[PDB]
Amino acid sequence: YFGKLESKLSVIRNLNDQVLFIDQGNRPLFEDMTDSDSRDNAPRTIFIISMYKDSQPRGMAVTISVKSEKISTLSSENKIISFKEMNPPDNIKDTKSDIIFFQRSVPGHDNKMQFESSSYEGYFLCSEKERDLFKLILKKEDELGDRSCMFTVQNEDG
């Protein structure tokens, strides 16, 4: 079971220092910081990362949420990325949750972070180039070390 401990406003960057944002179609994408749309994208680059106490410690249990009038929360339900129309909850009774990810440092690189789905073991948040877009996806990572599934997390107050 999980209990919410604290929340922080955060900026998430991929392996190429592109910044995670939510586009108008509610899709999580990565922008170059010289992107001509970076002015309009700015409010949608701020994420609420909530950290949870976990009765079965497996990594740092977090939810990733966005505020746009209402708060929505990243979900790995059905092994795809989506947003649930929910605030991060105070408590979660089960040991796995489609909105809980395990955040862990990369070996030898304490600043680089990976996010594993707590509901689908072996599935990680990753950045993937798809045509001209860079998308946040959920990907089954057999072997770790893929830098495309490594991020840095910057606190808005830090």
UniProtKB/Swiss-Prot annotation:
UniProt keyword Flavoprotein, yes or no: no
UniProt keywords, alphabetically: Cytokine, Cytoplasm, Inflammatory response, Secreted
Substitution effect: R13A: Reduces binding to IL18R1 and the ability to induce IFNG production
Cellular localization per UniProt: Cytoplasm, Cytosol; Secreted
Effect of M33A: Impairs binding to IL18R1 and the ability to induce IFNG production
Modified how: The pro-IL-18 precursor is processed by CASP1, CASP4 or CASP5 to yield its mature, active form. The pro-IL-18 precursor features autoinhibitory interactions between the propeptide and the post-cleavage-site region, preventing recognition by the IL18R1 receptor. Processing by CASP1, CASP4 or CASP5 induces conformational changes to generate critical receptor-binding sites. The mature form is then secreted and released in the extracellular milieu by passing through the gasdermin-D (GSDMD) pore. In contrast, cleavage by CASP3 inactivates IL18.
Record annotation: effect of changing K112A: Abolishes binding of the preformed binary complex of IL18 and IL18R1 to IL18RAP
Effect on the protein of changing D17A: Reduces binding to IL18R1 and the ability to induce IFNG production
Predominant localisation class: cytoplasm
UniProt induction comment: In macrophages, release is increased by endocannabinoid anandamide/AEA.
Record site feature (Cleavage), residues: D35, S36
Any single GO BP term: immune response
Single annotated GO MF: interleukin-18 receptor binding
Outcome (variant: M60A): Impairs binding to IL18R1 and the ability to induce IFNG production
Effect the entry attributes to changing D35A: Impairs binding to IL18R1 and the ability to induce IFNG production. Abolished cleavage by CASP3
Keyword Secreted set for record: yes
Documented effect of changing K4A: Reduces binding to IL18R1 and the ability to induce IFNG production
Outcome reported for the amino acid change (mutating D98A): Reduces binding of the preformed binary complex of IL18 and IL18R1 to IL18RAP resulting in impaired IFNG production
Signal sequence annotation: none
Quaternary structure and interacting proteins, as annotated: Forms a ternary complex with ligand-binding receptor subunit IL18R1 and signaling receptor subunit IL18RAP at the plasma membrane. Mature IL18 first binds to IL18R1 forming a low affinity binary complex, which then interacts with IL18RAP to form a high affinity ternary complex that signals inside the cell. Interacts with cargo receptor TMED10; the interaction mediates the translocation from the cytoplasm into the ERGIC (endoplasmic reticulum-Golgi intermediate compartment) and thereby secretion.
Function recorded in the entry: Pro-inflammatory cytokine primarily involved in epithelial barrier repair, polarized T-helper 1 (Th1) cell and natural killer (NK) cell immune responses. Upon binding to IL18R1 and IL18RAP, forms a signaling ternary complex which activates NF-kappa-B, triggering synthesis of inflammatory mediators. Synergizes with IL12/interleukin-12 to induce IFNG synthesis from T-helper 1 (Th1) cells and natural killer (NK) cells.
Family per record: Belongs to the IL-1 family.
Name the UniProt record assigns to this protein: Interleukin-18
Covered residues, full protein: 37 to 193 of 193
